[PDB]
Amino acid sequence: KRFERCELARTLKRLGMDGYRGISLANWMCLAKWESGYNTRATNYNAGDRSTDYGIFQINSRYWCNDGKTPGAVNACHLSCSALLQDNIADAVACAKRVVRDPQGIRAWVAWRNRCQNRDVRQYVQGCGV
């Protein structure tokens, strides 16, 4: 499923993302936009370390979810990576919350640093009624 901008903004808001650990909804939108283009079925294979990035937030299998094919990986969100490929993003959001509960926070995603950190992300939630 490829969410429409505002559709996703309200979806994230309903799931408790707005201001979760100090992160505004606009930042989460900016993350999803650059990570997957709002696409829940997005996946990126990293041939170098044999891990795969899953879903709307492109969450990595080495640490966050289990796919049974990433060497010496852990499953911190205690989810099968399949859970991160559903149209319903509740499980993915629970995992994204787990990710930011770590020391880096939203900085865990290099894409957020490159495309959202110290940028104007207001645009992502304008007109969405959030």
Q: Which of 7, 35, 49, 120 is catalytic?
A: 35
Q: Please report the resolution in angstroms.
A: 1.8
DSSP secondary structure code for residue 63 in this structure: T
C-alpha span between 7 and 29 (Å, rounded): 11
Please work out, in degrees rounded to the nearest 5, the angle formed at the alpha carbon of residue 110 by the alpha carbons of 8 and 98. Answer: 60
* Residue the block writes with tokens 């640093």: 113
106-124 core/surface letters (b: 16 or more CB in 10 A; e: else): bebbebbeeebeeeebeeb
Q: Is 125 helix (H, G, I), strand (E, B) or coil?
A: helix
Residue 123, amino acid: Q
- Amino acid making up residue 98: R
**Strand partners for 75:** none
- CA-CA distances (angstroms) from residue 1 to 16, 40, 51, 80? 20, 5, 23, 19
Number of domains in the chain: 1
Known catalytic membership, residue 7: no
The residue segments making up the domain with residue 123 are 1-130
The reply to whether 53 belongs to the active site is yes
Nearest residue to 56 via CA among 46, 45, 47, 44: 44
Method: X-ray
- Which CATH number covers residue 104? 1.10.530.10
Q: Which of 4, 7, 49, 53 is catalytic?
A: 53
What count of Cα atoms within 13 Å lies in the side-chain half-sphere of residue 108? Answer: 20
Q: Which residues contact 73 (CB under 8 A, 6 or more apart)?
A: 51, 61, 62, 63, 66, 67
- Tell me the C-alpha distance between 73 and 64, whole Å: 8
**CA-based angle 96:100:79, to the nearest 5?**
40
Pairing label, strands 51-54, 43-46: antiparallel
